[PDB]
Design a protein around this nucleic acid. Structure first.
Ligand code: ZN
Lengths: 208, 150, 138, 222
RNA sequence: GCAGCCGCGGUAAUACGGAGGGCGCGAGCGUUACCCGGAUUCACUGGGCGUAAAGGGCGUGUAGGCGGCCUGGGGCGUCCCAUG
RNA sequence: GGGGAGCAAACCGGAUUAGAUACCCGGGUAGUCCACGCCCUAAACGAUGCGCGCUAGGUCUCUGGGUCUCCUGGGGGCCGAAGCUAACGCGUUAAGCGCGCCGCCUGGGGAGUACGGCCGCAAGGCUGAAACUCAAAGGAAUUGACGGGGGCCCGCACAAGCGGUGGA
């Protein structure tokens, strides 16, 4: 059970916009537009001061839910990130942003993160030449993450790239829309990320 | 400017004939995320009021804190009669590692990664008080040179 | 009986500063002399001269303090906050060079006694030796 | 001005009730009395007076306080003679830690002074009359000098420090300089600028302040 | 009836039982049992003994532990190098 | 084994009391005194192991040396710097800053018991658990109430007084 249930509800739990559905979470409706209160029968109620724990918590989740990844991997990552020489936080987002499924999203070969998954599990994705269905896969720098010849004439993908002529790609990424390709340049830097989170809290959380 | 943070509040009892007239206790931490951190013990008959009181107190007992790349320039253990506190500097990426109280105090000190540990009696009050005289002691490589000169 | 010399010394030192005396006496002895030798060159104290008290040899260790504080209790920061014997008698502690300790993120100092003589952690390491780690002081 | 070797005045004061720390400041015992090394006192003065001069010409204020019975009348005099605030009668707990709360009493004096000049005097109860008349009386006792305090003083000239340790304690915590005509019984460790000297002797306090206030004046230029 | 602990329940239960809702985790989640941990609560790191539990009712001295200043020999402990 | 004035467990009576196998009164044996031998515990208490060095003084006092209206050594007290302590408190007679070395503690109750061994003439003692069971037991201080504790002060509260109810 890798989640998959009511979504732009979490956009609502956190109180920060969670780009979980893409188009639409741009139309007046990631719900945060016009209904910022959290879910539940008590959403509209005055909220008490959140224990240190609470914030440390809620902020872990914010990270997590964005990438939509079962705690088990998420925590695993964070573990693998503690073992690397670096800033225990920045490196976290490192692998976090290096997952095949994410890449595709940033490459624009998909409306949303979720969508990207399917694209991967269904195998519409080339990676340095061969297809790949395992999203959790880690895209090394200098890999041609692309689309299967087979998938190119797709009503979805097509309509997506059409949009790309008009949006810059992440600074650590390249792509040749014309040929529907794209390369992973180098691990993105914290300064390069946009995310409305505070790693520090996340780290701080994993020491309880 | 200054960010008020609430350590804790307790309600106390003073006795009298036929009643237990109460009294409220507030503890606040105040600072810049730069390096000045106040700390007050505000007592009053009404909480919002005690809080408001503690506020005043803290803004006065501030402590300039040396700040090498986010951490504390050198370890230190400080006994506060009861509670003792270990303060130990660490590398970026390690994040504050203490509890409620010392966090609250360090957090506002702008301390970013650091290694705590509470020992002996774990009395918020004291612990806090300790984490203060704790910080108050820290001295820079510079500050020390200046100290043994001539 | 006087069971540990150095120990006494350190304590006379410690015990004097705390009350704020200018200088304090102390039984002389080549060794004790080499420790005081360090302190002053390390700057924890002014210095020390050999002396005779009613016929006996003594070492006048001259104390060093900080400036007069402001506000209440203008008791000057002490140049020597901390000072304790590490290796005591009946629990002697010798260290290997690898094992030499870094003191107060290297703000304090450590003094051992190597076969190449009485030294500072820094010196020792620069010197590639180890020995009886006499004391912490910062 | 600078003043002689007028030893015909503060040679020594207290028996053996002294304060060890005061050791540096004494010459010897004679008939069971500590006698203050004057050659030294001179070295102190040369400093203490150096300080005040700095204050005076810099245009600061110095609060004179001495509650001792002897100095009583002389405090009043000297401060009066100087452009200064003094505490003659009694020292109130907080004329510095709690200045703002005290200054409010001043205002009371200010506000009562008025009514004892306006028409609204007898015109209104006579029970209150006295009830107010009294309030003035008392105010014009304690705050008689304290009135000149617009804000906190740049320094405190204390007479007998160990007696006023409160007033010192205060100053000490607000970072305000402390000057004192101290002797055997004091703890020099807390006087920013001391002046080792006999004090119960009217001739002592009378001289120490004279030359002190004289100095203050010649410093401002009048 | 709940319950790890403090406790909750005698007609107004955020603590029982159901429901709506919510949090957490997901082919899993709970429970029990056992290890280390928190516990510097056996304390080498890193504890104590006036009243909190703790000085032996006192002395005597056996084994043992511990020991003053200067100079030299030996170098066992101890430190450094190489090597297996 | 000797001794025995006074005192006095137990025990005999007396009064007190709802009762008194007690507190009060009168008697009284062991015992209490001595010698020899055993017992060996204790609020055997500074409730504070022994020894050495170091850290402001003031004052009272025992005692010794000195050129003795002051100095200097040793002991017993009270107040007190720095410091320490949970706090009371401690403070050169350390509960301060240090080294040596010994002893002892490790939740309460169950237990100073059980079991085992040692010792003793016996009474007993030394050593000394656990099962079970409880979430405390515990120190010092605070504010209160309270004391058949204290000091002081009030009210037709008592006294002093007049007049009444309780009877019909
Ligand atoms: Zn949405």
């Amino acid at each position: 059970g890798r989640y998959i249930g009511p979504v732009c509800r979490l956009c609502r739990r956190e109180g920060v916009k969670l780009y979980l559905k893409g188009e639409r979470c741009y139309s007046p409706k990631c719900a945060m537009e016009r209904r910022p209160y959290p879910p539940g029968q008590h959403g509209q109620k005055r909220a008490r001061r959140p224990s240190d724990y609470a914030v440390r918590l809620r902020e872990k989740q914010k990270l997590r839910r964005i990438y939509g990844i079962s705690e088990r991997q998420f925590r695993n990552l964070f573990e693998e990130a503690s073992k690397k020489k670096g800033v225990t936080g920045s490196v976290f987002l490192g692998l976090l942003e290096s997952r095949l499924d994410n890449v595709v999203y940033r490459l624009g070969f998909a409306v949303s993160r979720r969508q990207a998954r399917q694209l991967v599990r269904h195998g519409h994705i080339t990676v340095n030449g061969r297809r790949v269905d395992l999203p959790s896969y880690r895209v090394r720098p200098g890999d041609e993450i692309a689309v299967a010849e087979k998938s190119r004439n797709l009503e979805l993908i097509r309509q997506n790239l059409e949009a790309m002529k008009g949006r810059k790609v992440g600074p650590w990424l390249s792509l040749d829309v014309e040929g529907m390709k794209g390369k992973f340049l180098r691990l993105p830097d914290r300064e390069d990320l946009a995310l409305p989170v505070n790693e520090q809290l996340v780290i701080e959380f994993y020491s309880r | 400017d200054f960010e008020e943070k609430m350590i804790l509040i307790r309600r106390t009892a003073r006795m009298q004939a036929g009643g237990r007239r109460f009294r409220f206790g507030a503890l606040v931490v105040v600072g810049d995320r730069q390096g000045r951190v106040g700390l007050g013990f505000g007592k009053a008959p009404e909480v919002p009021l005690a809080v408001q009181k503690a506020g005043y107190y803290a803004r006065r007992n501030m402590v300039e804190v040396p700040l090498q790349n986010g951490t504390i320039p050198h370890e230190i253990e400080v006994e506060f009669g009861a509670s003792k506190i270990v303060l130990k500097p660490a590398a970026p990426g390690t994040g504050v590692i203490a509890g409620a109280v010392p966090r609250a105090i360090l957090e506002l000190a702008g301390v970013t990664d650091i290694l705590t540990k509470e020992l002996g009696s774990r009395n918020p009050i004291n612990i806090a008080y300790a984490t203060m005289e704790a910080l108050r002691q820290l001295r820079t490589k510079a500050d020390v040179e200046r100290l043994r000169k001539g | 009986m006087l069971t540990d010399p150095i120990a006494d010394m350190l304590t006379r030192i410690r015990n004097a500063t705390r009350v704020y005396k200018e200088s304090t006496d102390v039984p002389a002895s080549r060794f004790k002399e080499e420790i005081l030798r360090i302190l002053a060159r390390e700057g924890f104290i002014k210095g020390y001269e050999r002396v005779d008290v009613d016929g006996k040899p003594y070492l006048r260790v001259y104390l060093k303090y900080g400036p007069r504080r402001q506000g209440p209790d203008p008791r000057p920061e002490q140049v020597i906050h901390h000072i304790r014997r590490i290796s005591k008698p009946g629990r002697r502690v010798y260290v290997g060079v690898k094992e030499i300790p870094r003191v107060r993120r290297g703000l304090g100092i450590a003094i051992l006694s190597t076969s190449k003589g009485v030294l500072t952690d820094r010196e020792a390491r620069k010197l590639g030796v180890g020995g009886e780690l006499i004391c912490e002081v910062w | 001005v600078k003043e002689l070797l007028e030893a015909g005045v503060h040679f020594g004061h207290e028996r053996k009730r002294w304060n060890p720390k005061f050791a540096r400041y004494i010459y010897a015992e004679r008939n069971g009395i500590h006698i203050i090394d004057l050659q030294k006192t001179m070295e102190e003065l040369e400093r203490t007076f150096r300080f005040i001069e700095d204050l005076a010409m810099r245009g600061g204020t110095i609060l004179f306080v001495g509650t001792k019975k002897q100095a009583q009348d002389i405090v009043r005099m000297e401060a009066e003679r100087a452009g200064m605030p003094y505490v003659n009668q009694r020292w109130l707990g907080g004329m510095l830690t709690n200045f703002k709360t005290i200054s409010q009493r001043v205002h009371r004096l200010e506000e009562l002074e008025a009514l004892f000049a306006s028409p609204e005097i007898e015109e209104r109860p006579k029970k209150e009359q006295v009830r107010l008349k009294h309030e003035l009386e008392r105010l014009q006792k304690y705050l008689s000098g304290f009135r000149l305090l617009k804000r906190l003083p740049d320094a405190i000239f204390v007479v007998d420090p160990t007696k006023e340790a409160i007033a010192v304690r205060e100053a000490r915590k607000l970072f305000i300089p402390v000057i004192a005509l101290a002797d055997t019984d004091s703890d020099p460790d807390l006087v920013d600028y001391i002046i080792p000297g006999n004090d119960d002797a009217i001739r002592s306090i009378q001289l120490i302040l004279s030359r002190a206030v004289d100095l203050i004046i010649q410093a401002r230029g009048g």
